[PDB]
Design an enzyme around this catalytic site. Structure first.
Site, mmCIF file in Angstrom:
data_model
loop_
_atom_site.group_PDB
_atom_site.id
_atom_site.type_symbol
_atom_site.label_atom_id
_atom_site.label_comp_id
_atom_site.label_asym_id
_atom_site.label_seq_id
_atom_site.Cartn_x
_atom_site.Cartn_y
_atom_site.Cartn_z
ATOM 1 N N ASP A 25 0.817 -1.208 0.000
ATOM 2 C CA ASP A 25 0.000 0.000 0.000
ATOM 3 C C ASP A 25 0.849 1.255 0.000
ATOM 4 O OD1 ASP A 25 -1.827 1.957 0.063
ATOM 5 O OD2 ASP A 25 -2.850 1.113 1.854
ATOM 6 N N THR A 26 1.049 1.832 -1.191
ATOM 7 C CA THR A 26 1.823 3.067 -1.304
ATOM 8 C C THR A 26 1.149 4.259 -0.651
ATOM 9 O OG1 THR A 26 0.911 3.585 -3.484
ATOM 10 C CG2 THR A 26 2.891 2.235 -3.436
ATOM 11 N N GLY A 27 -0.157 4.192 -0.432
ATOM 12 C CA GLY A 27 -0.852 5.295 0.233
ATOM 13 C C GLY A 27 -0.742 5.294 1.732
HETATM 14 C C1 LIG Z 1 -1.888 3.892 7.916
HETATM 15 C C2 LIG Z 1 -3.308 3.701 7.335
HETATM 16 C C3 LIG Z 1 -3.497 2.342 6.792
HETATM 17 C C4 LIG Z 1 -4.297 3.988 8.418
HETATM 18 N N1 LIG Z 1 -3.451 4.697 6.262
HETATM 19 C C5 LIG Z 1 -4.541 4.900 5.543
HETATM 20 O O1 LIG Z 1 -5.615 4.305 5.725
HETATM 21 C C6 LIG Z 1 -4.419 5.967 4.486
HETATM 22 C C7 LIG Z 1 -5.196 7.180 4.979
HETATM 23 N N2 LIG Z 1 -5.111 8.325 3.955
HETATM 24 C C8 LIG Z 1 -5.889 9.450 4.492
HETATM 25 C C9 LIG Z 1 -5.241 10.124 5.684
HETATM 26 C C10 LIG Z 1 -5.872 10.169 6.916
HETATM 27 C C11 LIG Z 1 -5.310 10.836 7.976
HETATM 28 C C12 LIG Z 1 -4.057 11.373 7.778
HETATM 29 N N3 LIG Z 1 -3.322 11.321 6.630
HETATM 30 C C13 LIG Z 1 -3.933 10.665 5.551
HETATM 31 C C14 LIG Z 1 -5.717 7.841 2.756
HETATM 32 C C15 LIG Z 1 -4.997 6.618 2.225
HETATM 33 N N4 LIG Z 1 -5.040 5.524 3.180
HETATM 34 C C16 LIG Z 1 -4.336 4.384 2.621
HETATM 35 C C17 LIG Z 1 -5.302 3.400 1.917
HETATM 36 O O2 LIG Z 1 -4.609 2.721 0.878
HETATM 37 C C18 LIG Z 1 -5.808 2.382 2.926
HETATM 38 C C19 LIG Z 1 -6.806 1.341 2.346
HETATM 39 C C20 LIG Z 1 -7.036 0.240 3.405
HETATM 40 C C21 LIG Z 1 -8.094 -0.758 3.031
HETATM 41 C C22 LIG Z 1 -7.923 -1.579 1.911
HETATM 42 C C23 LIG Z 1 -8.934 -2.473 1.559
HETATM 43 C C24 LIG Z 1 -10.073 -2.571 2.307
HETATM 44 C C25 LIG Z 1 -10.219 -1.797 3.449
HETATM 45 C C26 LIG Z 1 -9.219 -0.899 3.799
HETATM 46 C C27 LIG Z 1 -8.146 1.949 2.021
HETATM 47 O O3 LIG Z 1 -8.728 2.752 2.781
HETATM 48 N N5 LIG Z 1 -8.692 1.548 0.884
HETATM 49 C C28 LIG Z 1 -10.063 1.865 0.556
HETATM 50 C C29 LIG Z 1 -10.284 3.021 -0.393
HETATM 51 C C30 LIG Z 1 -9.648 4.208 -0.554
HETATM 52 C C31 LIG Z 1 -10.059 5.124 -1.487
HETATM 53 C C32 LIG Z 1 -11.128 4.804 -2.298
HETATM 54 C C33 LIG Z 1 -11.842 3.646 -2.184
HETATM 55 C C34 LIG Z 1 -11.442 2.723 -1.256
HETATM 56 C C35 LIG Z 1 -11.946 1.354 -0.843
HETATM 57 C C36 LIG Z 1 -10.791 0.669 -0.099
HETATM 58 O O4 LIG Z 1 -9.904 0.084 -1.087
#
Ligand SMILES: CC(C)(C)NC(=O)[C@@H]1CN(Cc2cccnc2)CCN1C[C@@H](O)C[C@@H](Cc1ccccc1)C(=O)N[C@H]1c2ccccc2C[C@H]1O
Lengths: 99, 99
Positions: A25-27
């Site tokens: 997860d690059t995000g």
């Molecule tokens: C360290 C931690 C994991 C908490 N980071 C994140 O959640 C960050 C938060 N920032 C934000 C942030 C928050 C606070 C501070 N700095 C940054 C936005 C980007 N996310 C990273 C995302 O890639 C995380 C994934 C996790 C996930 C994957 C699959 C299923 C459930 C959860 C995520 O949220 N993905 C979801 C997703 C994302 C966008 C669009 C649609 C979808 C659906 C789903 O794929």
């Protein structure tokens, strides 16, 4: 290796003597692992996702093996729905995005 | 380009004719942009990640430029903490993970 993005980029990891599947997860700034009983001291932390914050346990100097490559660093443990390998460990395995 | 992960992988995008900064996020299934005015019809949708769900507007077949590469696909608009480019558009621009 190369991983395409048609599907979630899941790999096998080893942490705490257990094999798991985890998302590259690059995000994610941080690495977040599903609830598991890791040994030793930890610090409370709150981390923010797209939906708000969750409570996690912060463990330092934890060894993870990611698709056969070692990384040592901070791992957060709590009620996440997926194991997430974030940038703190991805940098250690030399991972890049390319287009 | 080849993007390393020591810092957040932020790129410039163009959407609706407007420049914005966005995060390349291999852990995101979808693309979600902060609240803005966007030309087109939309439909309500919910998406979930860490911390829970947010309500978004789903716009289909939107032209977006990502770091100078064209994509045309689904863009969600809503109260995301950061602009996120997810796999639906990363695939379009040919992005891969490498290590
Ligand atoms: C360290 C931690 C994991 C908490 N980071 C994140 O959640 C960050 C938060 N920032 C934000 C942030 C928050 C606070 C501070 N700095 C940054 C936005 C980007 N996310 C990273 C995302 O890639 C995380 C994934 C996790 C996930 C994957 C699959 C299923 C459930 C959860 C995520 O949220 N993905 C979801 C997703 C994302 C966008 C669009 C649609 C979808 C659906 C789903 O794929």
């Amino acid at each position: 290796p190369q991983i395409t993005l048609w599907k979630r980029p899941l790999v096998t990891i080893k942490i705490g003597g257990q094999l798991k599947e985890a998302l590259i997860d690059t995000g994610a700034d941080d690495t977040v692992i599903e609830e598991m009983s890791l040994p030793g001291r930890w610090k409370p932390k709150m981390i923010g996702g797209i939906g708000g914050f969750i409570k996690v346990r912060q463990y330092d100097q934890i060894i993870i093996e990611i698709a056969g490559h070692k990384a040592i660093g901070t791992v957060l443990v709590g009620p996440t729905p997926v194991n997430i390998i974030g940038r703190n460990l991805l940098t250690q395995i030399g991972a890049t995005l390319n287009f």
